[PDB]
Design a binder for this molecule. Sequence first.
Ligand SMILES: CCCCCOc1ccc2cc(S(=O)(=O)N[C@H](CCC(=O)O)C(=O)O)ccc2c1
Length: 429
Amino acid sequence: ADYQGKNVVIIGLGLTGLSCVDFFLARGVTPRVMDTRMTPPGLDKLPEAVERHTGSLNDEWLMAADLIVASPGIALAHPSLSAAADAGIEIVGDIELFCREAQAPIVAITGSNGKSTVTTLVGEMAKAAGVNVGVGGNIGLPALMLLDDECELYVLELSSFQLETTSSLQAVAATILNVTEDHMDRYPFGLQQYRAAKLRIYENAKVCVVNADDALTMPRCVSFGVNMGDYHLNHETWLRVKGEKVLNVKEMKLSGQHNYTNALAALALADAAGLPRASSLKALTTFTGLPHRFEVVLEHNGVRWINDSKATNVGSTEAALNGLHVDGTLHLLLGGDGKSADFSPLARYLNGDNVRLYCFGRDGAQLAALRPEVAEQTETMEQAMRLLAPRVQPGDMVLLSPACASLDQFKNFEQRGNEFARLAKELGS
Ligand SMILES: CCCCCOc1ccc2cc(S(=O)(=O)N[C@H](CCC(=O)O)C(=O)O)ccc2c1
């Protein structure tokens, strides 16, 4: 696309907003940026020649623009963006800009849970194939920063928000791993609207990879599943493709059924992208996992401290608990911005005499209510931890898998995960 002479407005700073700014400057276009936050991240890294309006949106800027580039963090339903859409002003995201430029095939991955793992695995599978691959998007580097014509493959994680402003994506392989309640604060029309956003990822996709165990992930598409699907499991556990064994999961550093289904999805995607299977399977044996994604940060004195800060929704926390083995007592930490999510689904995993809940952040109270007889409620996570540490016995597990966003008290789930690791080392000895 050609943006010359166009009046461009970017909504939202941070790394993404900056990646968008650099995108236009390099192309000889000076955009204006606005952020509803008084001091958005990156503000000081923004070139002085770039006009900025913070602390709110500027409708005079918005209605005068030829192109509005909206951060996934602002809803198209916002009246200001809504008025501009009515006026016929074109609105896009960074992912849209990226798609219009990319000169390599794109593997697009989305889903309520497992997208970063799968996106990282496909990245890993391309590296083992000797493919110059750009991995990023909703994780790692913002898509616009991955743009290089020497790049031979792009692997992008895409959120429902990003997909909402994208229309030019023609993925060589795309998937929705699953759809479970999340982001309801941004989807006033319920689960189906949320799903509708994710389904956009299949539009123009050369191959669609669906989850045979989750009907919501379906728009033929190649499928993956536990007991069924083109890519499925076999029980010792094996990853099978159309009846043929391809990998005994004991060769994987990752465990858990959902991580095995992740392996199948990554494989299905890698295959569709033409990546050599041998090297893709090798990558499945070398990947160790993502930080904050069910990460043991300390295992000392018979006690495991696991950092699953990346569990920012009920489905995710549920994955950590379903089948979880604990010798003694599970001290589970929940809390933050639950985003109006129904927490009930967790309750069935919260019975027995070996559970303790330590609920904090904005929705702490609501989280304690799952089983008030075994729950404590503090304001912060550090209080929750200094509260549980004394009660930790050999055989116990301290699990931070909050089922919520951390944006209410933290910059991001990584900050919350890192604070948990520091505290655990402190109290774990
Ligand atoms: C100009 C508008 C600026 C709005 C604030 O900036 C934002 C940019 C991107 C976001 C992504 C998302 S998000 O929803 O895609 N990611 C959060 C991560 C939670 C956590 O890390 O604990 C979530 O999944 O709940 C939420 C809010 C965002 C706000």
